[PDB]
Amino acid sequence: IEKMRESGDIHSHHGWLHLPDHKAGFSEEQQAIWQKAEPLFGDEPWWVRDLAKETGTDEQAMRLTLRQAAQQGIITAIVKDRYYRNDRIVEFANMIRDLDQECGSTCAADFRDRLGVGRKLAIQILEYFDRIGFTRRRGNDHLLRDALLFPEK
RNA sequence: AAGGAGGUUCAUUAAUGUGACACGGCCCAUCGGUUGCAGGUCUGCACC
């Protein structure tokens, strides 16, 4: 198998060995749900079990098809079973943006005193960004070793 | 001194039960839940 890898007959990424031709594109069978799922997802994203209830599709089927949708880059789970759009992820970064500059610490209080975004939401946002590397957590505060949150000045 | 310790009434014969084994004793987390409302992380009040 290694011999073929080195020849270049099989190109693999993240330890998954797929033919170089594969694009992880998907099938229509998924898209047909994703069309009705699109406006829904847009105006406010919601949880898996609720999604399945809204489109009359099996919970496990629905979660897996949306995980593939998320592999495509359409929706992001901030926490397991909770999926959002992209345009609100960048907005989550807009609210984290004012913390290092206005406070110099990261705390919960500003969830209610800045936009109105709930504590549960903000904390799951933070753990999503901690796994990503946008922020890191140590004792009382979050560090910024590797992100683009930083403005030029 | 309702008294005081004597006697009359109570026992023919009647052996044996193959092997192993139960009952079950310990903290008492003092229901849970991909649910709400708060706080930088413990649970307190609603839901149920």
mmCIF file of C-alpha atoms (C1' of nucleotides) in Angstrom:
data_model
loop_
_atom_site.group_PDB
_atom_site.id
_atom_site.type_symbol
_atom_site.label_atom_id
_atom_site.label_comp_id
_atom_site.label_asym_id
_atom_site.label_seq_id
_atom_site.Cartn_x
_atom_site.Cartn_y
_atom_site.Cartn_z
ATOM 1 C CA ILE A 1 0.000 0.000 0.000
ATOM 2 C CA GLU A 2 2.879 2.346 0.845
ATOM 3 C CA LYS A 3 4.434 1.579 -2.561
ATOM 4 C CA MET A 4 1.241 2.752 -4.263
ATOM 5 C CA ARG A 5 1.099 5.848 -2.002
ATOM 6 C CA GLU A 6 4.611 6.818 -3.072
ATOM 7 C CA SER A 7 3.874 6.131 -6.750
ATOM 8 C CA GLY A 8 1.034 8.640 -6.424
ATOM 9 C CA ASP A 9 -1.775 6.309 -7.467
ATOM 10 C CA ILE A 10 -3.538 7.066 -4.152
ATOM 11 C CA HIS A 11 -3.453 10.534 -2.567
ATOM 12 C CA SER A 12 -4.709 10.747 1.000
ATOM 13 C CA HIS A 13 -5.483 13.543 3.440
ATOM 14 C CA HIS A 14 -6.092 13.360 7.227
ATOM 15 C CA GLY A 15 -5.242 9.691 7.027
ATOM 16 C CA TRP A 16 -8.264 8.986 4.820
ATOM 17 C CA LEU A 17 -7.123 7.229 1.635
ATOM 18 C CA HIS A 18 -9.299 8.258 -1.287
ATOM 19 C CA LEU A 19 -8.537 8.318 -4.992
ATOM 20 C CA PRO A 20 -7.079 11.720 -6.075
ATOM 21 C CA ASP A 21 -10.158 12.115 -8.290
ATOM 22 C CA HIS A 22 -12.578 12.187 -5.320
ATOM 23 C CA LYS A 23 -13.857 15.618 -4.440
ATOM 24 C CA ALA A 24 -16.210 14.700 -1.525
ATOM 25 C CA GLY A 25 -18.899 16.257 -3.698
ATOM 26 C CA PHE A 26 -21.971 14.151 -2.592
ATOM 27 C CA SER A 27 -25.165 12.953 -4.198
ATOM 28 C CA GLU A 28 -28.508 14.519 -5.059
ATOM 29 C CA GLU A 29 -30.181 12.363 -2.311
ATOM 30 C CA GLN A 30 -28.670 14.913 0.151
ATOM 31 C CA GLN A 31 -29.168 18.059 -1.942
ATOM 32 C CA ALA A 32 -32.946 17.491 -2.233
ATOM 33 C CA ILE A 33 -33.204 17.930 1.528
ATOM 34 C CA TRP A 34 -30.591 20.751 1.482
ATOM 35 C CA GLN A 35 -32.789 22.853 -0.862
ATOM 36 C CA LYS A 36 -35.729 23.044 1.543
ATOM 37 C CA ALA A 37 -33.255 23.115 4.436
ATOM 38 C CA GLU A 38 -31.585 26.250 2.855
ATOM 39 C CA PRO A 39 -34.170 29.095 3.594
ATOM 40 C CA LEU A 40 -34.931 27.477 6.961
ATOM 41 C CA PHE A 41 -31.205 27.354 7.857
ATOM 42 C CA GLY A 42 -30.746 30.909 6.596
ATOM 43 C CA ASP A 43 -33.187 33.093 8.524
ATOM 44 C CA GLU A 44 -32.245 31.225 11.837
ATOM 45 C CA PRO A 45 -30.316 27.906 12.169
ATOM 46 C CA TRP A 46 -31.619 25.223 14.614
ATOM 47 C CA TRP A 47 -30.766 21.905 16.359
ATOM 48 C CA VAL A 48 -30.706 18.482 14.599
ATOM 49 C CA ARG A 49 -33.719 16.900 16.385
ATOM 50 C CA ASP A 50 -35.752 19.988 15.534
ATOM 51 C CA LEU A 51 -34.528 19.964 11.913
ATOM 52 C CA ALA A 52 -35.536 16.303 11.555
ATOM 53 C CA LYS A 53 -38.935 17.184 13.039
ATOM 54 C CA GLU A 54 -39.363 20.093 10.587
ATOM 55 C CA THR A 55 -38.627 18.151 7.402
ATOM 56 C CA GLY A 56 -40.069 14.760 8.464
ATOM 57 C CA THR A 57 -36.734 12.968 8.055
ATOM 58 C CA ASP A 58 -35.172 10.432 10.424
ATOM 59 C CA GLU A 59 -32.980 11.996 13.149
ATOM 60 C CA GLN A 60 -29.873 9.875 12.458
ATOM 61 C CA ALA A 61 -30.221 10.341 8.683
ATOM 62 C CA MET A 62 -30.740 14.117 9.139
ATOM 63 C CA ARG A 63 -27.718 14.494 11.480
ATOM 64 C CA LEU A 64 -25.419 12.564 9.130
ATOM 65 C CA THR A 65 -26.543 14.393 5.947
ATOM 66 C CA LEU A 66 -26.022 17.734 7.718
ATOM 67 C CA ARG A 67 -22.597 16.625 8.980
ATOM 68 C CA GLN A 68 -21.728 16.083 5.337
ATOM 69 C CA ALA A 69 -23.244 19.523 4.577
ATOM 70 C CA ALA A 70 -20.857 20.807 7.278
ATOM 71 C CA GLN A 71 -17.936 18.984 5.646
ATOM 72 C CA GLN A 72 -18.873 20.967 2.530
ATOM 73 C CA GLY A 73 -18.521 24.199 4.552
ATOM 74 C CA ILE A 74 -22.180 25.284 4.645
ATOM 75 C CA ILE A 75 -22.999 24.962 8.370
ATOM 76 C CA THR A 76 -20.799 24.732 11.460
ATOM 77 C CA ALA A 77 -21.507 22.862 14.687
ATOM 78 C CA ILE A 78 -20.450 25.035 17.600
ATOM 79 C CA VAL A 79 -21.229 22.046 19.850
ATOM 80 C CA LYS A 80 -22.421 18.511 19.072
ATOM 81 C CA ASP A 81 -25.910 18.559 17.387
ATOM 82 C CA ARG A 82 -25.972 22.385 17.051
ATOM 83 C CA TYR A 83 -25.395 23.786 13.572
ATOM 84 C CA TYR A 84 -25.173 27.429 12.473
ATOM 85 C CA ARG A 85 -24.548 29.391 9.290
ATOM 86 C CA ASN A 86 -21.178 31.087 8.469
ATOM 87 C CA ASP A 87 -22.457 34.680 8.563
ATOM 88 C CA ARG A 88 -23.139 34.356 12.282
ATOM 89 C CA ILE A 89 -19.752 32.719 12.970
ATOM 90 C CA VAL A 90 -17.959 35.839 11.695
ATOM 91 C CA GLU A 91 -20.426 37.813 13.850
ATOM 92 C CA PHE A 92 -19.369 35.724 16.852
ATOM 93 C CA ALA A 93 -15.882 36.880 16.071
ATOM 94 C CA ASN A 94 -17.169 40.520 15.960
ATOM 95 C CA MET A 95 -18.399 40.197 19.539
ATOM 96 C CA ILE A 96 -15.171 38.552 20.706
ATOM 97 C CA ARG A 97 -13.234 41.393 18.881
ATOM 98 C CA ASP A 98 -14.134 44.066 21.454
ATOM 99 C CA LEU A 99 -12.980 42.070 24.505
ATOM 100 C CA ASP A 100 -9.179 42.341 24.285
ATOM 101 C CA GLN A 101 -9.403 46.024 23.277
ATOM 102 C CA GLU A 102 -12.143 47.252 25.616
ATOM 103 C CA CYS A 103 -11.521 44.985 28.619
ATOM 104 C CA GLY A 104 -8.224 43.119 28.275
ATOM 105 C CA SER A 105 -9.917 40.065 29.791
ATOM 106 C CA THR A 106 -12.645 37.677 28.698
ATOM 107 C CA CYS A 107 -15.666 37.267 30.968
ATOM 108 C CA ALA A 108 -19.309 36.317 30.623
ATOM 109 C CA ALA A 109 -20.965 39.685 31.624
ATOM 110 C CA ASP A 110 -20.553 41.292 28.227
ATOM 111 C CA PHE A 111 -22.837 38.603 26.675
ATOM 112 C CA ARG A 112 -25.815 40.509 28.085
ATOM 113 C CA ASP A 113 -24.203 43.948 28.147
ATOM 114 C CA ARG A 114 -23.057 44.007 24.467
ATOM 115 C CA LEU A 115 -25.480 42.529 21.913
ATOM 116 C CA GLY A 116 -27.984 40.400 23.860
ATOM 117 C CA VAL A 117 -26.558 37.018 22.893
ATOM 118 C CA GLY A 118 -27.249 34.445 25.594
ATOM 119 C CA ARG A 119 -24.724 32.989 28.033
ATOM 120 C CA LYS A 120 -25.271 29.391 26.811
ATOM 121 C CA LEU A 121 -24.670 30.510 23.236
ATOM 122 C CA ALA A 122 -21.556 32.590 24.043
ATOM 123 C CA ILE A 123 -19.984 29.766 26.089
ATOM 124 C CA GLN A 124 -20.551 27.175 23.335
ATOM 125 C CA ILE A 125 -19.137 29.728 20.854
ATOM 126 C CA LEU A 126 -16.063 29.973 23.082
ATOM 127 C CA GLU A 127 -15.526 26.199 23.270
ATOM 128 C CA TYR A 128 -15.914 26.024 19.463
ATOM 129 C CA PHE A 129 -13.240 28.702 19.099
ATOM 130 C CA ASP A 130 -11.050 27.055 21.762
ATOM 131 C CA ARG A 131 -10.974 23.816 19.764
ATOM 132 C CA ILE A 132 -10.368 25.874 16.586
ATOM 133 C CA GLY A 133 -7.616 27.943 18.184
ATOM 134 C CA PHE A 134 -9.285 31.357 17.882
ATOM 135 C CA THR A 135 -9.029 31.620 21.693
ATOM 136 C CA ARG A 136 -7.509 29.438 24.423
ATOM 137 C CA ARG A 137 -8.638 29.007 28.017
ATOM 138 C CA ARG A 138 -6.478 29.198 31.135
ATOM 139 C CA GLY A 139 -7.920 30.022 34.631
ATOM 140 C CA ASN A 140 -9.945 33.231 34.480
ATOM 141 C CA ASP A 141 -9.173 34.243 30.841
ATOM 142 C CA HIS A 142 -8.774 33.338 27.166
ATOM 143 C CA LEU A 143 -5.466 33.849 25.313
ATOM 144 C CA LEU A 144 -4.930 34.891 21.672
ATOM 145 C CA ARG A 145 -1.773 33.098 20.564
ATOM 146 C CA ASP A 146 -2.735 32.149 16.995
ATOM 147 C CA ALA A 147 -5.795 33.951 15.644
ATOM 148 C CA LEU A 148 -6.696 36.779 13.279
ATOM 149 C CA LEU A 149 -9.052 38.393 15.834
ATOM 150 C CA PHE A 150 -6.418 41.167 16.187
ATOM 151 C CA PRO A 151 -6.918 44.458 14.323
ATOM 152 C CA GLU A 152 -4.002 46.217 12.645
ATOM 153 C CA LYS A 153 -3.826 48.945 15.304
ATOM 154 C "C1'" A B 1 -52.258 -16.289 113.764
ATOM 155 C "C1'" A B 2 -57.900 -18.997 108.986
ATOM 156 C "C1'" G B 3 -54.550 -21.101 109.331
ATOM 157 C "C1'" G B 4 -50.170 -26.324 109.623
ATOM 158 C "C1'" A B 5 -47.840 -30.105 106.553
ATOM 159 C "C1'" G B 6 -49.196 -34.502 105.934
ATOM 160 C "C1'" G B 7 -51.991 -37.857 102.958
ATOM 161 C "C1'" U B 8 -56.059 -39.494 98.811
ATOM 162 C "C1'" U B 9 -55.456 -38.167 93.278
ATOM 163 C "C1'" C B 10 -51.546 -38.123 87.532
ATOM 164 C "C1'" A B 11 -48.523 -41.639 83.245
ATOM 165 C "C1'" U B 12 -48.189 -51.297 79.997
ATOM 166 C "C1'" U B 13 -45.353 -50.747 75.541
ATOM 167 C "C1'" A B 14 -44.608 -46.763 71.374
ATOM 168 C "C1'" A B 15 -38.130 -48.001 66.669
ATOM 169 C "C1'" U B 16 -36.622 -45.222 62.360
ATOM 170 C "C1'" G B 17 -36.501 -40.647 58.730
ATOM 171 C "C1'" U B 18 -30.688 -41.865 52.322
ATOM 172 C "C1'" G B 19 -27.145 -37.064 50.108
ATOM 173 C "C1'" A B 20 -26.408 -31.664 49.058
ATOM 174 C "C1'" C B 21 -28.817 -26.775 49.476
ATOM 175 C "C1'" A B 22 -31.647 -21.932 50.086
ATOM 176 C "C1'" C B 23 -33.977 -17.464 52.728
ATOM 177 C "C1'" G B 24 -30.260 -11.603 51.147
ATOM 178 C "C1'" G B 25 -26.625 -7.687 52.939
ATOM 179 C "C1'" C B 26 -24.345 -4.178 51.609
ATOM 180 C "C1'" C B 27 -24.108 4.300 52.456
ATOM 181 C "C1'" C B 28 -28.455 6.342 51.893
ATOM 182 C "C1'" A B 29 -26.016 8.033 44.341
ATOM 183 C "C1'" U B 30 -30.245 11.104 49.290
ATOM 184 C "C1'" C B 31 -35.071 9.978 40.669
ATOM 185 C "C1'" G B 32 -34.042 11.570 36.085
ATOM 186 C "C1'" G B 33 -33.563 15.126 31.469
ATOM 187 C "C1'" U B 34 -29.045 16.445 24.490
ATOM 188 C "C1'" U B 35 -35.311 21.225 28.184
ATOM 189 C "C1'" G B 36 -35.426 26.846 30.730
ATOM 190 C "C1'" C B 37 -32.868 31.295 34.117
ATOM 191 C "C1'" A B 38 -28.488 32.937 36.357
ATOM 192 C "C1'" G B 39 -23.546 33.602 37.168
ATOM 193 C "C1'" G B 40 -16.515 31.597 34.528
ATOM 194 C "C1'" U B 41 -18.470 26.196 36.907
ATOM 195 C "C1'" C B 42 -21.577 24.935 41.752
ATOM 196 C "C1'" U B 43 -25.654 23.190 41.136
ATOM 197 C "C1'" G B 44 -30.454 26.620 43.268
ATOM 198 C "C1'" C B 45 -35.136 27.563 41.307
ATOM 199 C "C1'" A B 46 -38.798 26.232 36.916
ATOM 200 C "C1'" C B 47 -40.278 22.528 33.838
ATOM 201 C "C1'" C B 48 -41.982 18.218 33.898
#
